[PDB]
Amino acid sequence: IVEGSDAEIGMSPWQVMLFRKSPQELLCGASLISDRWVLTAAHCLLYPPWDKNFTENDLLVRIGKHSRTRYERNIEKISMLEKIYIHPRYNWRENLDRDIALMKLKKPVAFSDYIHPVCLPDRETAASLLQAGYKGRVTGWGNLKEKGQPSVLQVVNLPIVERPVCKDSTRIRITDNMFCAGYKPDEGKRGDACEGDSGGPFVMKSPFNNRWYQMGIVSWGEGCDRDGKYGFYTHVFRLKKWIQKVIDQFGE
């Protein structure tokens, strides 16, 4: 997160840290969508040209966290994963289309002041909120810039940008499974997700019911916070049928 600020305690209680067992390191963000499932970006898990291919035995997830490095006794939980599931039509060869993955916990996690899932959206909540200019929120322990690493979860609020603008500012092929978001140079304000933020959530608060919904997943960008450029996010509602299909059959 670049030009963000410190999260407040409990501000983002579905926020999840994807964590390599050995060597120990922060891999990505992720999110708690129920007591049994974490949501993330595929390129967090599998990216064959960099020899990325993390099985479940390789990772842990840490939930409830605030500080980046500290072990937060009496606040965080740590869980082993049962299984990973990457979108089968995930396109790493070109543009990271369908850059989504599911992860199933071995044990259901207990909720608390710090551990609470977020909603996924319905068609309506999708229609209503996914609009040029409407703002959402990205949280992450990623790079402060393109020192370095933050001490605590960082937050920034960003406007959704209209498809033509998004399309016309990268030379990569946008699919309808992506959206982009960030401010434009003439809008003054700054802000972007960065390395280490991948896989973490882009949320919006519905004014119909007061719930936070995850409309996006940090997927990619070119550098971080560069003028005329934008963060790309994985359109979660577009892929929601695969999300449910996976849960219904492996939710157990």
Partner: peptide, 29 residues
């Protein structure tokens, strides 16, 4: 099903420091 209501915020009628900017963007423009 209790998805998205935060214990430290919404469940106790407390707003965070920046969500209003989210809502200002839904109504203004």
């Amino acid at each position: 099903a209790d998805c998205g209501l935060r214990p430290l915020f919404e469940k106790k009628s407390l707003e965070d420091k920046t969500e209003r900017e989210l809502l200002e963007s839904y109504i203004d423009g």
